[PDB]
Amino acid sequence: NNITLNLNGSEVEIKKGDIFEVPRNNYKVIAFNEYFDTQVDDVIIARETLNGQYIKRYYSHQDITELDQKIKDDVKLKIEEKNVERPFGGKTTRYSLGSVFKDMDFFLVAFSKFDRENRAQLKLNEYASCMLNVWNEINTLHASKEVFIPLLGSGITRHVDSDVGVNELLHIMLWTFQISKVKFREPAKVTILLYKNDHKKINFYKL
Amino acid sequence: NNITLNLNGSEVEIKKGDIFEVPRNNYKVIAFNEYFDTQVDDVIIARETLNGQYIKRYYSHQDITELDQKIKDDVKLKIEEKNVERPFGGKTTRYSLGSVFKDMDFFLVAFSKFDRENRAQLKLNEYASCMLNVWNEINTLHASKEVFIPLLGSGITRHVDSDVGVNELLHIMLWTFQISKVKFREPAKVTILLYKNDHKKINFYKLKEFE
Numbered sequence: 527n528n529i530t531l532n533l534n535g536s537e538v539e540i541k542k543g544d545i546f547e548v549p550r551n552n553y554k555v556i557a558f559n560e561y562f563d564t565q566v567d568d569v570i571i572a573r574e575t576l577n578g579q580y581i582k583r584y585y586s587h588q589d590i591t592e593l594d595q596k597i598k599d600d601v602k603l604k605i606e607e608k609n610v611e612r613p614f615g616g617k618t619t620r621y622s623l624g625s626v627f628k629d630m631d632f633f634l635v636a637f638s639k640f641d642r643e644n645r646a647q648l649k650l651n652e653y654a655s656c657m658l659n660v661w662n663e664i665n666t667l668h669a670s671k672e673v674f675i676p677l678l679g680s681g682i683t684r685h686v687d688s689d690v691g692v693n694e695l696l697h698i699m700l701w702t703f704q705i706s707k708v709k710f711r712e713p714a715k716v717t718i719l720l721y722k723n724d725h726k727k728i729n730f731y732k733l
Numbered sequence: 734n735n736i737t738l739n740l741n742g743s744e745v746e747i748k749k750g751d752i753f754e755v756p757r758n759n760y761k762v763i764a765f766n767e768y769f770d771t772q773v774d775d776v777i778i779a780r781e782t783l784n785g786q787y788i789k790r791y792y793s794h795q796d797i798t799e800l801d802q803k804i805k806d807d808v809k810l811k812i813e814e815k816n817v818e819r820p821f822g823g824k825t826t827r828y829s830l831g832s833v834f835k836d837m838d839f840f841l842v843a844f845s846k847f848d849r850e851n852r853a854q855l856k857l858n859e860y861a862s863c864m865l866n867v868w869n870e871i872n873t874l875h876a877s878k879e880v881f882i883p884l885l886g887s888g889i890t891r892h893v894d895s896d897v898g899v900n901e902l903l904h905i906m907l908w909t910f911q912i913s914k915v916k917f918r919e920p921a922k923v924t925i926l927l928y929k930n931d932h933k934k935i936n937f938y939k940l941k942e943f944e
């Protein structure tokens with residue numbers, strides 16, 4: 527099923543699709559972690575995540591070195607902490623949740639937190655506040671292009687202080703989008719893509 | 734014009750009322766600043782705010798000393814920074830926005846930020862993130878009692894990066910309430926109070942659309 531929600535003049539469309547099949551004339555969101563980690567060894571970053579699929583599909587190992595340098599050099603990324611201890615490897619600079627690094631037509635999001643076991647996790651309020659910063663970045667950077675975003679949080683992300691369901695993750699995305707709209711009266715045209723069986727789990731009647 | 738909203742099995746009532754006329758057996762929310770400042774001299778804290786009215790109504794200058802001590806003794810208040818320079822006076826410990834200090838039947842909220850001019854202000858995302866933490870504390874502390882709350886942000890607070898109106902502040906309060914409900918599936922029974930003729934500036938039709 528495909529739907530288009532008119533949110534007081536701003537249309538958000540929810541439909542089935544593949545984030546990697548969107549034409550190049552559009553922006554695509556991919557959730558990274560609070561370190562923008564790029565090591566896809568199934569230890570730090572897992573190849574099953576979009577974070578992992580994106581790096582393996584578009585980046586050779588020597589290209590990853592340049593990507594790490596461009597992120598490090600992006601002065602707009604707000605730093606929360608430096609010289610953090612990663613016991614199994616990984617980058618040592620932690621960024622604010624919801625920070626967006628622009629990688630050509632892709633918006634790479636500092637989405638989830640990592641502990642010393644490299645377990646991606648968010649408290650519910652951290653998830654809500656992260657999405658707020660994501661819409662803030664998206665509404666700033668869209669430049670009249672359309673933005674495609676997956677159902678952020680509905681993957682391996684551990685929601686450690688709630689029993690939130692995928693339908694509720696979608697509702698939090700729409701609520702924080704409506705909050706962000708108040709600041710950006712002309713927001714981006716956003717499309718939320720559902721993947722495979724996740725399209726059936728969403729109740730479009732309530733949506 | 735008084736209405737009750739049913740938000741997925743949770744009732745949030747919006748009515749006209751006076752926060753200082755609520756029965757003692759209920760919890761009442763009052764917005765302080767990020768420092769929990771208590772000096773009402775119209776320089777730091779202005780007597781026109783609920784922050785100032787609450788202090789003048791219930792606290793002598795001698796009692797304020799004990800209140801200042803009880804706040805800094807509260808280990809639950811998360812500290813963002815210590816020893817900030819206040820050029821015109823005030824407290825130097827800064828707390829996370831939305832921190833709630835419980836003062837008997839009152840919830841005192843670290844609501845707004847202060848600059849070196851002592852200007853209460855919030856960016857819109859700071860306001861939304863503040864309300865998120867407020868509902869978190871309220872849903873944690875309510876203990877089956879009813880919680881009464883004013884329309885936070887609709888007073889002297891400066892919204893510095895948007896043209897947010899009164900109705901939109903109320904909509905953000907409800908949206909952040911709905912988010913916090915996902916974590917607290919038995920949320921507090923909440924009543925939002927509108928003062929004097931502020932109910933006349935509220936579009937109650939748009940409020941019912943939250944159902």
Ligand SMILES: Nc1ncnc2c1ncn2[C@@H]1O[C@H](COP(=O)(O)OP(=O)(O)OC[C@H]2O[C@@H](n3cnc(C[C@H](N)C(=O)O)c3)[C@H](O)[C@@H]2O)[C@@H](O)[C@H]1O
Nearest residue numbers: 545558559571572575576638646676678679680681683721
């Ligand atoms: N082609 C496609 N098009 C459109 N939608 C698609 C799609 N394919 C799949 N979807 C669906 O889209 C939803 C989102 O997908 P996804 O982004 O993967 O999930 P997420 O929860 O939003 O984010 C994951 C978080 O974990 C971190 N992380 C990275 N590696 C680790 C391992 C670590 N050691 C640990 O154990 O934690 C942790 C990573 O940095 C990130 O922050 C999902 O429903 C999926 O089915």
Ligand SMILES: Nc1ncnc2c1ncn2[C@@H]1O[C@H](COP(=O)(O)OP(=O)(O)OC[C@H]2O[C@@H](n3cnc(C[C@H](N)C(=O)O)c3)[C@H](O)[C@@H]2O)[C@@H](O)[C@H]1O
Nearest residue numbers: 752765766778779782783845853883885886887888890928
């Ligand atoms: N009896 C009643 N019952 C029910 N509702 C009532 C009521 N009375 C009034 N209402 C209505 O309730 C709404 C909220 O009232 P109120 O709390 O006053 O406004 P607020 O924006 O939510 O919070 C103010 C912020 O500024 C800070 N601040 C403190 N002093 C300064 C001066 C500083 N030098 C500067 O210049 O900034 C700044 C203070 O710490 C706080 O964070 C409003 O619509 C009002 O009409």
